[PDB]
Amino acid sequence: EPIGQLRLFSGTHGPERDFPLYLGKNVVGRSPDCSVALPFPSISKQHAVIEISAWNKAPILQDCGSLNGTQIVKPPRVLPPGVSHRLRDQELILFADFPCQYHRLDV
Amino acid sequence: MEPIGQLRLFSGTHGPERDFPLYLGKNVVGRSPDCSVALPFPSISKQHAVIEISAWNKAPILQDCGSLNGTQIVKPPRVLPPGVSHRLRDQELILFADFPCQYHRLD
Known about the structure:
The structure is a homodimer.
Chain A: E1 4-8, E2 17-21, E3 24-29, E4 36-37, E5 48-52, E6 60-63, E7 70-72, E8 77-78, E9 85-86, E10 92-95, E11 98-104
Parallel strand pairs in A: 3-4
Antiparallel strand pairs in A: 1-2, 1-11, 3-5, 5-6, 6-9, 7-8, 7-10, 10-11
C-alpha cells in the first residue's frame, strides 16, 4: 500500500503522473525496475533514492551521483550526491529539469 | 486575446495549486488585487515582478520590481536583483518570495 506519492508534473514530455512510494527504498531512475520509473534520457539509470523508514517519519532523499542532478527547489540548492535530505510534505524537487512534488498519503 | 503562456503556482501550506494565464504585454505578479497574476500572500509585494511577452513565439522577460522578499530563478539558483531582465525558459521554475511557480509556453 502506497504511503506517499511523487507527482511528476505535466509538461512538454506529456501529462502529470503520480508514482506511489512505499516503505523502504524507492529508487528514482530511468529503468522499469525503479519504484519511480522515469522514461526520460536526461534521468540517470539510478538517479536518486527516497528511503522511507517509517510512514510516520520524513522520507530521506539522496541523489546517487546522477549526470543531471537532483535539486531542492526551496531554498534552491543542488543536492550533492550522497547527502541526505529530509523531504517535507508538499516539497518540490527537480530531477534533472523535471519538477516533482512529494505528498504523504493515507491508506 | 488568447493566453500565450501560463504560470502554475504549486500547492503548499498556503493553499492548493492554481494556474494563471499569461498574455501579450505586461503581466504584473503581485499581492495588489488588480495584478495580472494576483498572489494573495503577505510576503508578496504589491507589485512584485512583471513578465513581459512581446510575441507568441518569443520567450517572456521576467524582472523583479524592487520586491521586499525577492524573485529567484530556481535552476541555476539565482536571485534576480530589481532591474535585471531574465529570459524565462519554458518549463522552468521561479520563486516569488518563498512560493515556487512553473512557467509554460502554451500551444
